[PDB]
């Protein structure tokens, strides 16, 4: 027994019914593909290292490396999706969009996605200290990120096609679970 | 890099994904593997329904196998002894054996992305 309350992924990753396949769109180190051993997930990540790690961490992880928009997932395959902390590093408000939309195309007609991004209630575009390794030794540099106001990332989801199911604020991030738009 | 994997790939090329000619790949195996795991009669039957079966049936022949039915069994009894024999060697194929060194070719852009102990990489 937990005692905690589930956070927002965990929930939403444990409420997907039995044997549901899922795509991970920037796993990152692969932290929410054990969360549910019910659920088959691929996941994905830009980054070779952390994917690396993801894999290394467990192996029976399905993971690969691709980019997050021009990625390799294929169209309305998936029960499920899920964007924790990726669509934020966009820098264009056309390639943040585009973004939302990939991860869309991924759902079934019933599929849902979660998205969770950086809030501004923590100007928009920032600059924040990150480690990259290079030649075996780890720099400090700054990697964009957008922090998203109130019914932005809401905005992004109707402008892609989507449909808003459900919206809340933990710990200085804006979600959203979406699914397509009774259209498409 | 297990074998269902490959259901659920394709090409990252925008032009061979907006042409319909992304998925499926096709794959062929410098090396493979078999990793032990728990069998799930219930699990493997709710995959057919995610499952495209005509690219399963490539993929597995790019690989070298023809041990599959022509079309997608049709299972209702997933723990019914009739079905073991049959859900045992799914289970066999698609989640025992794993890819570490391989190749996976598009048809369409003429592109060879490579999978890598045992990553499937999809980058230009
Ligand atoms: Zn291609």
Same mark, same amino acid.
């Given at each position: ?68 928009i ?16 990726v669509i934020h590093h966009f820098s264009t408000p056309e390639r943040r969009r585009e973004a @939302? %939309? ?8 019933? =599929?849902?996605?979660?998205?969770? !991004?950086? *809030?501004?209630?923590?100007?928009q575009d920032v600059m924040v ?10 720099? @400090? %540099?700054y990697r964009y990120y957008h922090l998203y106001?109130? =019914?932005?990332?809401?905005?992004? !989801?109707? *402008? ?25 | ?124």
């Amino acid at each position: 027994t937990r005692y905690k309350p589930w956070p927002i992924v965990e929930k939403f990753l444990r409420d997907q019914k039995d044997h549901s396949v899922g795509v991970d769109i920037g796993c990152g180190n692969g932290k929410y593909m054990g969360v549910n051993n019910k659920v088959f997930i691929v996941g994905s990540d830009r980054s070779d290292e952390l994917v690396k790690l993801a894999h290394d961490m467990d192996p029976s992880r399905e993971v690969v490396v691709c980019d997050a928009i021009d990625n390799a997932h294929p169209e309305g395959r998936f029960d499920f999706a899920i964007s924790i902390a990726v669509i934020h590093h966009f820098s264009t408000p056309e390639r943040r969009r585009e973004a @939302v %939309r990939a991860i869309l195309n991924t759902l079934r007609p019933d =599929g849902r996605a979660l998205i969770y !991004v950086w *809030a501004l209630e923590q100007d928009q575009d920032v600059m924040v200290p990150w480690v990259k390794k290079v030649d075996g030794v780890e720099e @400090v %540099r700054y990697r964009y990120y957008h922090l998203y106001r109130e =019914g932005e990332i809401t905005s992004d !989801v109707e *402008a892609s096609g989507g449909k808003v199911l459900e919206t809340g604020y933990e710990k200085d991030n804006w979600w959203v679970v979406a699914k397509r738009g009774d259209d498409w | 890099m297990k074998f269902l994997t490959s259901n659920f790939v394709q090409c990252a090329s925008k032009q061979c994904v907006s042409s319909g000619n992304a998925f499926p790949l096709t794959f062929s195996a410098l090396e493979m593997v078999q990793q032990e795991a728990e069998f799930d009669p219930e699990f493997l039957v709710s995959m057919l329904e995610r499952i495209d079966w005509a690219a399963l049936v490539k993929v597995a022949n790019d690989l070298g196998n023809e041990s599959l039915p022509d079309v997608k069994p049709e299972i209702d009894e997933p723990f019914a002894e009739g079905n073991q024999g049959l859900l045992q060697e799914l289970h066999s194929l698609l989640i025992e054996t794993c890819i570490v060194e391989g190749t996976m070719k598009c048809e369409n852009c003429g592109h060879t992305y490579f999978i890598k102990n045992s990553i499937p990489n999809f980058l230009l």
